From a paper:
Human manganese superoxide dismutase (MnSOD) is a CPET-based oxidoreductase found in the mitochondrial matrix that reduces ROS levels by eliminating O2•− with the unpaired electrons of the active site metal. The second sphere of MnSOD harbors five residues (His30, Tyr34, Gln143, Glu162, and Tyr166) and information about their protonation states would be of significant value in deciphering a catalytic mechanism.
To visualize the effect of the electronic state of the metal on the active site protons, all-atom, D-labeled neutron structures were obtained for Mn3+SOD and Mn2+SOD to resolutions of 2.20 and 2.30 Å, respectively. The two data sets collected were from the same crystal treated with appropriate oxidizing and reducing chemicals and the redox conditions were maintained during each data collection. For the oxidized resting state that is described by both chains of the Mn3+SOD neutron structure, the proton bridging His30 and Tyr166 appears to be moving and this suggests the possibility of Tyr166 alternating between an ionized or protonated form and a deprotonated or protonated Nε2(His30). Nδ1(His30) is also observed to be both deprotonated or protonated. An SSHB is seen between WAT2 and an ionized Tyr34 while Gln143 is in the canonical amide form hydrogen bonding to WAT1 as a –OH molecule. Instead, the MnSOD neutron data suggest that the proton donor to WAT1 is internally sourced from Gln143 without the direct involvement of solvent and cannot be Tyr34 due to its observed deprotonation in the Mn3+ state. An ionized tyrosine residue at physiological pH is unusual though is potentially explained by polarization from the pronounced positive charge of the metal. The rates indicate an important role for His30 k1 that may correspond with our observations of its changes in protonation in Mn3+SOD. Starting from the five-coordinate Mn3+ resting state, Mn3+ acquires an electron (in reality from the substrate superoxide) that coincides with Nδ1(His30) acquiring a proton from the nearest solvent molecule (the crystallographic position of WAT2) and Tyr166 gaining partial covalent character from the proton of Nε2(His30) to form a LBHB.
Numbering used by the authors:
A (entry chain B), B (entry chain A), C (entry chain A), D (entry chain B): 0 to 198
C-alpha cells in the first residue's frame, strides 16, 4: 500500500522559541521517518502471512504493526496540531464543547496537562471525541498506541510526551514543555477535526 | 483460504473417566468451532483493511485476531496432545531432555502443574522448546495468547486451564483436573513435536 | 485487621430458576472464600515486606493482592446487587440518570450486555459512576481487577462473566446467562450505591 | 522506612567521553532523586491504606509503587554497574558461564545489545540469573518494572535505554549509546552479583 513520510507544513524552526529547530528536525526526519519505514516492512510481511494463513506469524507481527503504525498515525496528526499561526484559545462550537464538558477552557488546559505530565514512561496525551456518548474526552496512550485504534475515540489534539519530544530543550522538566506547547497549538486544525465528527 | 475445525482423533467419550464426554463435546463442537468461524471472519476484515492501508482498522482488529486465532491454534494442538492410549511416561530423547532440564519426570510434572494452577483467570500452561537456547521451557499464557506467536517457544504440550475445560466435572478444584489429565497425555505426539525441533 | 466473607442476604436457592443453587453455593462458599483467605495471607506478607522496606517483595506481591483483593471486592458487591425480589426497572433519580446518559433503560441494558459478553476470557461488566464528569459509565474489567481501584469509577452494578458464574447452568451460551440475570437485579441496592455518590 | 538517594561512587564526569557529565548529573540528581522521593510518599500512603484494610487504595497505589520503586531499584543497580575502571571482558567463572550459556562473550554482547535496542519505548535490558534453572538469561523490562520483582531473575547487569539516558549525547542513535557503554561496564561488580547467586 506504501505509507509515506508527510512533508511538514512549515519550517523546522517555525515553532521557536517554544520548540527549537533541532527537536523538530530530529523528530520529523529521524523518528517519524523510522516509523514509516518499519511500518511498510511490517505491512508487507503481514500480507505474506495472511496469504499463507499463517496465524502464528500474524500474531508475532502485532507489536511491530501497532508500534510503528501508531507512530506513523500519531506523528502525522501531531504535525497538523501545531502551527506558527497557533496559540490562544479556540472559538465557535469547539470552545462551547470545551465549556460544557470541562467547565472552562482553563480547566480543560489543567486536565490535559495533568494527563500528559502523568504518563509513566513514553506515551501521548489526547483530547478525543466519544462518538457513542457525544462529548469530549481526555485520554492517555502508552508508547505509540494510537487513540482511535485502541480506544475508539476520535483524535482531536495530541501531545507527544516521549522524552525525544522535549529533552534537548527542557531536559527532565516535562511541565515546562507542556506549558510552552500551548503557544503553538493549531486550534484551526483541532476545530476541523471536531466538526468532521459532527453530522 | 480457510482455516477448518479439525476432527477429533477419538470418540468424545474416549477420555473417560479422566475427562467426561460432555466436556469434550462442548469444548470441541462449541468452543473451538466458534474460534475458527470468528477467525475466518476476522481474517477477511483484515484483508480489506490491509488492502486499503487502513492502519487504524488493522490495529483495532488485533485483539480479535489474537483471541480467535490463538484459540484455534491452542485447541488444535490440545486435541493431538491427548489420547485414550496415553498416560505413563515418555521414552527416547524426550525423557532424557526432561530429566536434563528438570531433574526428573516427576519434578517436570510438578513444575508444569504449578504453572497451570497458578494462572489467574483463563489461560494455558505449556511445555515449550527454546530453539535459541536448545532446551525445554515451561511457560504460561493468558486467555488464548498462543505460545509461539507471543513468546517464540515451540509448543510441545499444552494444558487448557480455562474454566470451561474442567468445571463441569471438577468444579473449582483445578488441581483435581490437573492430576487426571496426566493419564491421557499423548506422549507419542509430544515426542513427534519435540523431534520436529531436532535436526 | 481481618477481611471477612460476608453472609449472603438470601438463601442459596433464592435466585432460581435464573441462577441455580449449586452455582450460588459454589460461587460463595468456595470461590469467594478462597479470595478472602488468600487476601488475608497476602496482606500479612505485604506488612512484613513493607516493614522491612523490601521494594522487590512489595512489587512481587502485587498480582496476588490485586487478584484476591479484587476478587473479594467484586464478589461482595455482586451479592448485594442481586435479590429474589429484584428485576424490573429502577425508579427515581437512577432511572432518569440512565435515560439521560444512555437514551433509555433498554439501550443501557444492551450496552452493559454487549460489554459483558465482549469480555475475552474472565472478567466483569460494570455500571459505574464518574465522579469527575458526574455521569454514568459502562466499563469492563479483566479477571478480578476491581473497578474503583483500577479506573476510578464508583461501582454501581457488576456482572460476573467468569465462566464459573454460569457454566454449570448455561454452558457456553453467555448471552443466555446475561438475559436471565436482569430478572434478579437488586435495583434498590444499585439506587443506594448511586445516591451515595450524590450529595 | 525511608529510602535515600545513594551517593555516586565516582565523579559525574568520570565516564567521559562514553557518557558525558551532563547526562550523569541529570540522571542521578534529577531522575533518580524523583523516583526516591515519590517512592517514599507512595510507601507512606500504602502503610495507611494497609492499616485501614482499604483494598481499593492499596490497588490504586500499585502503579506508582512499581514505577517509582522500580526506578529506585534499577538506577541504584545501574550506578554500581558502571565505573571509570570498567570496560574489557570479565574473568573467572562469570566468563565461563557466559561461554556456556551464550556460546561466546561476543555472542552475549550481540544478544544483550539486540534486547536493549529492541525495547519499544522506555525500558531496560538485563543480564539476569535464573536460580531455578541455574543459568544466565537475558530479559527486557518495560518502563521501570524491576527485573527480580517481575520475573524472578537476579539482576547482574542492567542497561538503561530510556531516552533520558543517552539522548543529549547520542540523539536518536540508540546503537551508538549501546556500543559506547561496554567501555565503562564494571565487570567486578557484575561478578560479585553473580557469585552472590552461587552457593
Ligand atoms: Mn515523537
Ligand atoms: Mn479451551
Ligand atoms: Mn466470580
Ligand atoms: Mn534512567
Amino acid at each position: 500500500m506504501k505509507h509515506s513520510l508527510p512533508d511538514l507544513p512549515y519550517d523546522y524552526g517555525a515553532l521557536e522559541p517554544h520548540i527549537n529547530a533541532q527537536i523538530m528536525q530530529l523528530h520529523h526526519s529521524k523518528h517519524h521517518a523510522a516509523y514509516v519505514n518499519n511500518l511498510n516492512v511490517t505491512e508487507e510481511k503481514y500480507q505474506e502471512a495472511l496469504a499463507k494463513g499463517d496465524v502464528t506469524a500474524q500474531i508475532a507481527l502485532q507489536p511491530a504493526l501497532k508500534f510503528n503504525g501508531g507512530g506513523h498515525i500519531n506523528h502525522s496528526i501531531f504535525w497538523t496540531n501545531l502551527s506558527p499561526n497557533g496559540g490562544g484559545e479556540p472559538k465557535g462550537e469547539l470552545l462551547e464543547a470545551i465549556k460544557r464538558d470541562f467547565g472552562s477552557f482553563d480547566k480543560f488546559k489543567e486536565k490535559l496537562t495533568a494527563a500528559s505530565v502523568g504518563v509513566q514512561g513514553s506515551g501521548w496525551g489526547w483530547l478525543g471525541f466519544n462518538k457513542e456518548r457525544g462529548h469530549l474526552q481526555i485520554a492517555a496512550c502508552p508508547n505509540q498506541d494510537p487513540l482511535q485504534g485502541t480506544t475508539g475515540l476520535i483524535p482531536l489534539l495530541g501531545i507527544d510526551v516521549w522524552e525525544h519530544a522535549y529533552y534537548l530543550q527542557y531536559k527532565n522538566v516535562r511541565p515546562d514543555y507542556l506549558k510552552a506547547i500551548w503557544n503553538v497549538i493549531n486550534w484551526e486544525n483541532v476545530t476541523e477535526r471536531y466538526m468532521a465528527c459532527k453530522k
